[PDB]
Amino acid sequence: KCIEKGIVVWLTGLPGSGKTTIATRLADLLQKEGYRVEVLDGDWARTTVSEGAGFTREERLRHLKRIAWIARLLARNGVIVICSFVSPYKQARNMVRRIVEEEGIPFLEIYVKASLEEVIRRDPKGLYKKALKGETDPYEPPENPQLVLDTESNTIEHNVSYLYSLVKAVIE
Template identity: 60%
Template structure:
């Protein structure tokens, strides 16, 4: 594996169950196939490691995501392609994350878009069902808002298309920008 001369951060945001982590994992695997170091960070990883002490209040989510921002920046400045998959529901916090990362490396906000109905239908962890029943509080898309990005670098509509299509669009976007080789 080789490090890129300059790494970058792809920040995938969207509703829970929109497919962010799946896209990140598949994209990172394809990047590794061409010999480039790639890492995937997602909410499950972060909340079980660097953010075990935070909940889901607005302030806790901000602290959680700023920690992740610093980790992604560190990895990327050392030549790693970083795919960060986080709901990150608030525009102002995503802007803060972008400012932290872009001080040293390229940052690309990618909105993984699905309807709330599709996210509820997928619901791999049963969290929407529990939130709709009132068992889970502050759940994004149910009783806490998701603020759609106003001008993301890329929108991946991940509903009604195979996930491989979304991954291909993401990798094509990065190759067109010259941060990755053509796939």
């Protein structure tokens, strides 16, 4: 398919909330339909555009602005860009939104909601190793997310379906 303008889908939520799997399944659906799609996540970024440590808030902010700009270039060239980043800070996410919206590109902020208690209770191993590896910063939910995907009340498939519906309502 050859659409003039794409969109930016921003998945924000706690690590372990299952953001990437949702992003991944969404991408498969859209690609199968002929859409140009790019999934951008921290794993990818760490080795490519954001390689070079930095966990200071100044650094993460520079990292997020960079992602925002990359999503803006791709979407303005017809790509559906799906971003999966914890992006815990509201102000940071709002800065990302403005960069994308300045281009006239739709910015769909998706809150992938999971409970902090449940995420740590199911992964004591990971918490422990993050403690050993050098891991105070509370997650700030969106004030106006275009969608909230409750990963605990619904199945991954129904959540993917909810997101796919919104995407199509926007791009079709």
